[PDB]
Amino acid sequence: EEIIWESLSVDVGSQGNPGIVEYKGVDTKTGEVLFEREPIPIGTNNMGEFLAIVHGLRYLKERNSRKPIYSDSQTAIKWVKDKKAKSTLVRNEETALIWKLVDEAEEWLNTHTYETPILKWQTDKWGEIKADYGR
RNA sequence: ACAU
DNA sequence: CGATGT
Ligand SMILES: [Cl-]
Ligand SMILES: [Cl-]
Ligand SMILES: [Cl-]
Ligand SMILES: [Mg+2]
Ligand SMILES: [Mg+2]
Ligand SMILES: [Rb+]
Ligand SMILES: [Rb+]
Ligand SMILES: [Rb+]
Fold it and tell me: Where, in this chain's numbering, is Mg(2+) 2 bound?
């Protein structure tokens, strides 16, 4: 119903899907960029959306912040809830980096606690998420 | 169908 | 138009 402005918003950007994947997190209220992942040569949209949420969890935990995280990705929200990224991307030499990051993200979720609410950004009502790449 |  | 996902 109402945007929770006191929050972190995350999003993926890609060149191809699968293709080059990056992600960032912004302060929902101001658009200030709070973190940005160096581009990963091959990944999927959903792997990037997942990594962005997990990085947000880690970022807020390190800072003792109870703010929620917004993502527009139904898939990634579910993967984080399950602590399992059910990607179809082939595991081979050229996808090794993205899969290492995804594996490490799951490992972190399995060994740490958090209360951060992970909320669906309602694009149809609110427009593009504030972390969007505009591409 | 919905979300990207 | 293609691809990633529930
Ligand atoms: Cl990552
Ligand atoms: Cl909340
Ligand atoms: Cl959701
Ligand atoms: Mg998105
Ligand atoms: Mg976007
Ligand atoms: Rb902490
Ligand atoms: Rb975009
Ligand atoms: Rb589809």
Answer: 11, 49, 72
**Are the CB atoms for A12 and A71 separated by under 8 Å?**
no
C-beta neighbour count of A1 within 10 angstroms: 4
Comparing CA positions, the residue from A34, A26, A22 lying closest to residue A101 is A22
- CATH code, domain carrying A55: 3.30.420.10
Query: How were these coordinates obtained?
Result: X-ray
Domains of chain A: total: 1
List bases in chain C with any atom under 7 Å of a protein Cβ: 2-6
Report CA A128 to chain centroid distance, whole Å: 15
Resolution limit in angstroms? 1.4
In terms of residue numbers, what domain contains A66?
Answer: 1-135
**C1’ B2 / CA A74, Å:** 9
